[PDB]
Design a binder for this molecule. Structure first.
Ligand SMILES: [Hg+2]
Ligand SMILES: [Hg+2]
Ligand SMILES: [Hg+2]
Length: 838
């Protein structure tokens, strides 16, 4: 035990009790603890003398609780040789000492610990003691107290795209990261070729797991160094954030296993994670411990991944893994009966891939089968910004997962709020920042009160040792960008027509071929040139959508989800089995459940009873109304329960009749549903030459995609200029919470339309000229762009569209307009038709 002085405070006090004999100048005063009123007493008279000012009482009052930790010895400064009157000023010098009972003495007690760390921090501000810096440019300042540091210009927790690009500009702009060593995995266990940056992330990820056995022979930003005073060793160290002090320099190494791998999309995060698994797939230290002399899955790596990427991960693992001894399986649909026994058993798989929705579903119903009665070896979250909402069942589920090593693979750790990082920290369990009180007191509140640079330094301080972030725009040591971004990548995706679509396309081909046989049997093929191109056009329309030749349900998937929610709310589980009445025959219990017919307004019928009503009302051509409440019920809006009934989900309302989706719209939706989780905020452009096809696409896309995650913009081309630019205005509005689609016509192209924000293009149909399609795509990419423009061309296999592509290939070889008289032009007209029908 010892004591030591660190600073003094000079302040006047207001007299409370008069003094008969004036107090000595060097009076050894004291502080008694009882808008805050801390009392100033003396040691001789044992009476009260004064009340301190408010701004000084706020500093003294909480410090008196830590008496053994920080003692305050106030001395008297001026004696006017007079009895203290009622209101005289008491000039005091408060000598502040530090006792070893605070120094190096380090149940949900965050409030007790922050109150100390804060009162101590306010004490330092009063005595105006500052740390020592040792670099050429000075680092961060001490974080200030509550309702201080010039709090002004209140800012919301939600972030601007400008505000967000400023956050990245500091965490991705760490020190030189181009000198990270390259770890190359041997081809005995891994059959892919990592890039230069991928070998760096592997070495860093192995370093983060402290796997030094796979490296080739390869302080404390929050703490700061203070200096003792010398009036009334020469250094000490402290962390004002937690109130912890240490006589020696605390070089506490990194503690958590793993980290966050944030990288711009296109740097191969998935491949780097796989290289990590193929290098270290089990806890070697645990294996030796158990045999040299339980719920730990010391050999299994759990990968939680979006649903739309569940099969790609299984695929990419098989394409990369060479060691057959380590197996990889997908946990989905309760396929593994006792997963707890599986991952702990002798045949434990090395990798298990599953969905957040599976993690969410098993957390809610208290699934003791697995995933939560087992501590995994390594958890890897792909697109980890899913858990960014602290209050959703999915986040609570992920945070409940236990593992020795944790990884977060996300290209965008912050979507639209600063505290999206908190759950990333809460997952990694970074004490004390996993605790919410530590986060809201040192990051949230200072940010919410406009002192944002203060919060960004704290954020950048905790994530720097744990987060690694590289950018495709970064330069290597040789002088090259990490990724050579081409202007565009165009890919032809061949599709095959549905069973119904082929029968239509084959019928239209007869009329096309028959018209060729007519003109050819009349001595001149061009005599039916106009009549031929008509049938060729109809074939082209059949490829896009059959409705382009000449009832549709009026309920979107968002509405069905809402109707299903209400239906499960009306018919809730209870002691007895679930039963459904019928509005026509008053049957208390409809059997079977597949015979239940539910109207647009959620009223239950027997499927024959409702059908009999509709047939009877349609045979008399009378407006259809619900037999129960007399509301407009459309026949296409009749609903039924999905068969079978999912026990984990409940009743699901699907359309009674089925509706037709063309092969191309089915394929586009297949892409879009995957881009949502692949890359947040992306602007996609959808080209088609047929305007009515764009009208169909708008209706189908908005019906099959959630509104809060996919926003559809369609350029009517028949609107005033201010609205058209207002559409582009909202289309260039980058929103990482959704993806934006611009449906515009290939005919007009992008003439006078800025389309630079687009990262992806979808060509829904080909045209006679390659120039028009090329010109539309070429107005999206501009040199000096962050992302290459990914283009997909949907072409119906063995159809006219495949033929038109061959015509374009001809034009590119010769030209679009190679002039010539009507003698040379007939040959081109004939050859084009031959190329269409061969
Ligand atoms: Hg019925
Ligand atoms: Hg009804
Ligand atoms: Hg050809």
């Amino acid at each position: 035990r010892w004591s030591r002085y660190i600073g003094s405070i000079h302040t006047m006090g207001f007299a409370t009790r008069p003094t008969v004999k004036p107090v000595p100048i060097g009076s050894r005063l004291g502080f008694k603890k009882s808008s805050h009123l801390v009392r100033l007493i003396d040691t001789s008279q044992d009476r009260e003398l004064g009340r301190m000012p408010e701004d000084v009482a706020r500093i003294l009052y909480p410090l008196l609780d830590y008496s053994e930790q920080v003692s305050l010895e106030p001395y008297l400064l001026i004696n006017n040789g007079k009895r203290f009157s009622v209101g005289d000023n008491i000039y005091i010098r408060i000598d502040c000492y530090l006792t070893s009972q605070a120094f190096v003495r380090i149940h949900g007690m965050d409030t007790r610990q922050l109150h100390r760390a804060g009162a101590i921090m306010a004490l330092f501000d009063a005595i105006n003691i500052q740390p020592v810096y040792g670099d050429t440019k000075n680092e961060m300042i001490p974080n200030y107290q509550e309702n201080t540091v010039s709090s002004s210009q209140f800012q919301d927790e939600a972030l601007n795209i400008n505000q967000l690009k400023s956050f990245y500009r500091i965490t991705q702009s760490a020190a030189s990261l181009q000198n990270l060593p390259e770890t190359t995995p041997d081809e005995s266990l891994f059959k892919l070729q990592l890039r230069r940056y991928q070998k760096q992330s592997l070495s860093w990820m192995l370093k983060r797991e402290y796997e030094y056995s796979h490296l080739s022979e390869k302080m404390n930003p929050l703490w700061k160094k203070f200096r003792w005073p010398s009036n009334s060793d020469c250094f000490f160290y402290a962390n004002l954030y937690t109130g912890e002090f240490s006589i020696e320099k605390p070089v506490i190494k990194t503690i958590i296993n793993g980290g966050i791998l944030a990288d711009e999309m296109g740097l191969g995060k998935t491949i780097s994670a796989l290289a990590l698994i193929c290098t270290a797939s089990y806890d070697e230290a645990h294996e030796k411990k158990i045999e040299s002399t339980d719920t730990y899955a010391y050999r299994t790596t759990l990968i939680v991944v979006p649903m739309s990427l569940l099969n790609q991960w299984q695929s990419e693992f098989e394409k990369a893994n060479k060691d057959l001894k380590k197996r990889c399986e997908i946990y989905y649909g309760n396929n593994i009966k006792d997963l707890r026994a599986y991952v702990l058993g002798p045949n434990a798989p090395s990798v298990i891939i599953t969905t957040y929705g599976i993690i969410q579903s098993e957390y809610g119903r208290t699934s003791t089968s697995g995933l939560f009665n087992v501590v995994f070896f390594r958890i890897i979250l792909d697109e980890g910004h899913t858990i960014r909402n602290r209050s959703t069942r999915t986040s609570k589920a992920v945070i409940a997962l236990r593992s020795s090593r944790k990884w977060i693979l996300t290209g965008t750790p912050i979507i639209n709020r600063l505290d999206d990082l908190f759950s990333l920290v809460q997952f990694l369990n970074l004490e004390p920042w996993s605790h919410i009180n530590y986060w809201k007191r040192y990051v949230s509140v200072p940010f919410e009160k406009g002192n944002y640079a203060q919060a960004f330094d704290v954020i950048n301080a905790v994530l720097e040792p744990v987060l690694l972030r590289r950018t495709k725009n970064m330069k290597d040591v040789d002088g090259k960008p990490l990724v050579s971004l081409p202007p565009k990548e165009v890919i032809v995706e061949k599709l095959q027509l549905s069973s119904s679509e082929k029968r239509v396309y084959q019928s239209m081909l007869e009329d096309a071929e028959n018209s060729v046989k007519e003109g050819l049997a009349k001595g001149d093929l061009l005599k039916n040139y106009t009549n031929i191109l008509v049938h060729i056009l109809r074939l082209r329309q059949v490829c896009c959508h059959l409705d382009l030749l000449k009832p549709k349900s009026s309920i979107s998937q968002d509405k069905l989800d809402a109707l299903s929610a209400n239906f499960r709310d009306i018919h809730s589980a209870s002691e007895q089995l679930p039963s459904f009445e019928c509005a026509i025959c008053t049957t208390e219990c409809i059997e079977p459940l597949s015979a239940v017919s539910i109207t647009e307004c959620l009223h239950t019928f027997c499927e024959p009873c409702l059908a009999e009503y509709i047939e009877f009302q349609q045979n008399k051509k009378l407006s259809i109304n619900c037999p129960y409440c007399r509301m407009p019920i459309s026949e296409a809006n009749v609903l039924k329960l999905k068969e079978p009934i999912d026990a984990e989900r409940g009743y699901e309302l699907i359309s009674f009749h089925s509706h037709f989706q063309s092969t191309k719209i089915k394929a586009l939706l297949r892409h879009l549903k995957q881009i949502q989780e692949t890359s947040p905020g992306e602007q996609i452009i959808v080209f088609s030459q047929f305007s009515s096809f764009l009208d169909i696409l708008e209706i189908e896309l908005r019906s099959h995609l959630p509104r809060d995650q996919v926003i559809i913009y369609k350029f009517d081309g028949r609107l005033d200029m201010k609205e058209r630019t207002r559409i582009l205005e909202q289309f260039h509005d980058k929103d990482l919470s959704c993806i934006k689609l611009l449906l515009l016509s290939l005919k007009t192209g992008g003439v006078g339309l800025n389309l630079t924000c687009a990262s992806r293009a979808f060509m829904m149909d080909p045209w006679w000229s390659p120039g028009m399609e090329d010109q539309a795509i070429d107005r999206i990419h501009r040199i000096g762009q962050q992302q290459t423009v990914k283009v997909v061309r949907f072409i119906i296999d063995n159809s006219v569209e495949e033929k038109m592509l061959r015509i374009q290939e001809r034009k590119r070889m010769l030209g679009d307009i190679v002039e010539g008289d009507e003698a040379e032009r007939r040959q081109k007209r004939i050859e084009e038709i031959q190329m269409l029908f061969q």
